[PDB]
Design a protein around this ligand. Structure first.
Ligand SMILES: [Zn+2]
Lengths: 351, 232, 77
């Protein structure tokens, strides 16, 4: 639980407030670069490294079979467990582009070969979605589960725009909450399904979720329709009683009412959580830990690494986890003069 | 507002009722929107202009009814998107930037094929076909390698968003020509096709002797960058 | 057409009126009421057929280009 200030020797003009971080086969990749890809790297995905407290960024490549992806702003993240068919993969959908519109398309990223000369190779397969297709949105949540023992995924959360009936060119940049429907998603086929239960009182956004052994717990986020941030941590138990993919939902008592969190797994089913924002202006400050099992989710207030002042004062901030307790937080480096790198960075470790 | 013509009633494809007499003087340039954000980020710029673009689209088909001169009259419009400079021109066409193989905003030729022949070129660029090429690039329905796919897609790498017929800049329109004639004189004081590859010394030498020559006969100081009047 | 600012205008207005027995210029409030006929959002019109996803209102004026950006801090500011 220690923090240390890092700086990017270069590659600073290219980090937007939203972005995602994935780890697989060693190195860690940043995704969602600001604006469209330049000539430097047409992929946009960057291999990110911490070397002697400095931040280095190199380019990533692809196969021929790979299908190329635009730099989504703030999509959903999901890790496919390493097994048949191809271990391993990361499912991404769908966020919004450098322009304001949603993807409504599922993509799967995998690693292929290496090096040769310490190079890395990836590919991105789009997967068409038939149904009963889920509506386009952003900031929602997606997770992976195995029901006796078949592997599928659940989708829930996320705002969206008003339909193109009251889509008003003076509110044309307003968002509204998608109705609270759960969605079931298999990969082959990609036949998605929509479901709803009455305990799904309302949808919200930015609520981190987690799951284990085909049972899923949604944690705290924020509702806009009622301006609140309900502490209702939500349980659901999913099972494909073939061929009926039946779910059962329930409300639990305690869910932490912070929004836009940052998570790192220190082990198998343990997650240190920085958390971004508790209240409407007061950012989240504490640093929590989550264990979880069939007994339930157990919560503890771990030791918060004592922030610096310049970070303790800025309004907002963000970050990701490089993996295994390690993490990076980033603050708008609002100062004079602008470098123009407007973002300070802090490495943060557990124990 | 550029021009207004007629379409009633027979063939009469157009009688220019009014053509503006001087479209350049800002005296006639009306503002529509102002934004305290740099042209840099695509984010905020699309964020604000989205409503505007969608409106412009929804304004081509239907007909506007105006109570003008005591009469309810019907109005259709044609829309040209011109007054952009090369930088944003690309930035709203989805091409790469800047001086890569794809160089012409209209003839999608590269440098080398534009060096073989220089005038046999047909205007093939259009907003719609660029949208199509983008779909091609993203799906890659042939799973072609990265660079080969960028070649087969011809400059279209990022989804364009703003339909705009570009045109040659009437402002600079000369500056590359100017620097080219300047290099011509600098390499003609030299015998560049007699000594094919000179270094920096004779370069600066030819520059200085040429500029003293111009100051001697036409009375012009040398300059570092070529504005308009120097070129003229 | 001359960048002339309101305080100035009113000043020179009182000046010339009390100077020579006449009302040469018009005072502000009435000049501005008269102006309101030149900014956008003053003339009726129609559109046949109706515009696609465009508010039917016609009397609006100077709008804010945020387009109702949900000000929630978490998201992009
Ligand atoms: Zn041509």
């Amino acid at each position: 639980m220690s923090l240390q200030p890092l700086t990017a020797v270069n590659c600073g003009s290219l980090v937007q407030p939203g972005f995602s971080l994935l780890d697989l086969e060693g190195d860690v990749y940043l995704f969602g670069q600001k604006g469209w890809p330049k000539r430097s790297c047409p992929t946009g995905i960057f291999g990110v490294r911490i070397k002697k407290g400095e931040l280095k960024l190199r380019a990533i490549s692809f196969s021929n079979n790979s299908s190329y992806l635009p730099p989504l702003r703030c999509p959903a993240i999901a890790h496919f467990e390493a097994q048949d068919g191809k271990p391993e993969c990361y499912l991404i959908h769908g966020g919004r582009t450098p322009n304001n519109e949603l993807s409504s398309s599922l993509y799967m990223l995998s690693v292929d070969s290496r090096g040769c000369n310490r190079k890395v190779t990836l590919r991105c397969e789009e997967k068409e979605l038939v149904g009963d297709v889920p509506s386009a949105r952003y900031g929602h949540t997606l997770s992976v589960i195995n029901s006796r023992g078949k592997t599928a995924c659940v989708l829930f959360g996320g705002r969206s725009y008003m339909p193109p009936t009251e889509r008003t060119t003076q509110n044309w940049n307003s968002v509204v909450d998608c109705p609270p429907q759960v969605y079931l998603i298999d990969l082959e086929f990609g036949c998605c399904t929509a479901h709803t239960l009455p305990e799904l009182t309302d949808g919200q956004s930015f609520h981190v979720a987690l799951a284990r052994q085909d049972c899923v717990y949604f944690l705290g986020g924020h509702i806009l329709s009622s301006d609140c941030r309900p502490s209702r941590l939500i349980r659901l138990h999913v099972e494909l009683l073939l061929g009926s993919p039946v779910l059962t939902c329930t409300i639990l008592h305690e869910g932490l009412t912070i929004t836009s969190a940052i998570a790192s797994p220190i082990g198998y089913h343990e997650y240190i959580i920085f958390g971004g924002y508790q209240s409407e202006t007061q950012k989240r400050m504490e640093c929590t830990y989550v264990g979880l099992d069939d007994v339930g989710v157990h919560m503890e207030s771990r030791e918060p690494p004592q922030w610096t002042s310049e970070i303790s004062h800025s309004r907002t901030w963000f970050g990701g986890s490089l993996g295994k307790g390690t993490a990076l937080v980033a603050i708008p480096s609002e100062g004079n003069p602008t470098p123009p790198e407007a973002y300070h960075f802090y490495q943060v470790s557990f124990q | 507002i550029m021009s207004i013509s007629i379409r009633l009633e027979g063939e009469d494809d157009g009688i220019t009722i009014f053509q503006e007499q001087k479209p350049n003087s800002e005296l006639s340039c009306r503002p529509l929107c102002l934004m305290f954000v740099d042209e840099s980020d695509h984010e905020t710029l699309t964020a604000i202009l989205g409503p505007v673009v969608a409106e412009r689209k929804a304004m081509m088909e239907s007909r506007l009814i105006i109570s003008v001169g005591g009469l309810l009259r019907s109005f259709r419009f044609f829309f040209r998107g011109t007054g952009y400079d090369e930088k944003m021109v690309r930035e709203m066409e989805g091409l790469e930037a800047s001086g890569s193989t794809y160089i012409c905003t209209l003839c999608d030729s590269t440098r080398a094929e534009a060096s073989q022949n220089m005038v046999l070129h047909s205007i093939t660029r259009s907003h719609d076909e660029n949208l199509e090429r983008y779909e091609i690039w993203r799906k890659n329905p042939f799973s072609e390698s990265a660079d080969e796919l960028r070649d087969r897609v011809k400059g279209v790498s990022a989804k364009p968003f703003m339909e705009t017929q570009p045109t040659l800049d009437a402002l600079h329109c000369d500056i590359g020509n100017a620097t080219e004639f300047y290099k011509i004189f600098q390499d003609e004081i030299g015998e560049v096709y007699q000594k094919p590859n000179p270094s920096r010394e004779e370069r600066r030498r030819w520059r200085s002797t040429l500029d003293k020559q111009l100051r001697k006969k036409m009375k012009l100081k040398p300059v570092m960058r070529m504005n308009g009047n120097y070129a003229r | 057409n001359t960048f002339l600012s309101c305080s100035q205008y009113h000043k020179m207005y009182r000046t010339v009126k009390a100077t020579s027995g006449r009302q040469i210029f018009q005072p502000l409030h009435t000049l501005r009421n008269a102006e309101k006929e030149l900014l956008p959002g003053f003339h009726q019109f129609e559109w046949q057929p109706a515009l696609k996803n465009v508010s039917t209102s016609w009397d609006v004026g100077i709008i804010d280009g945020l387009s109702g950006w949900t000000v929630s801090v978490d998201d992009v500011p």
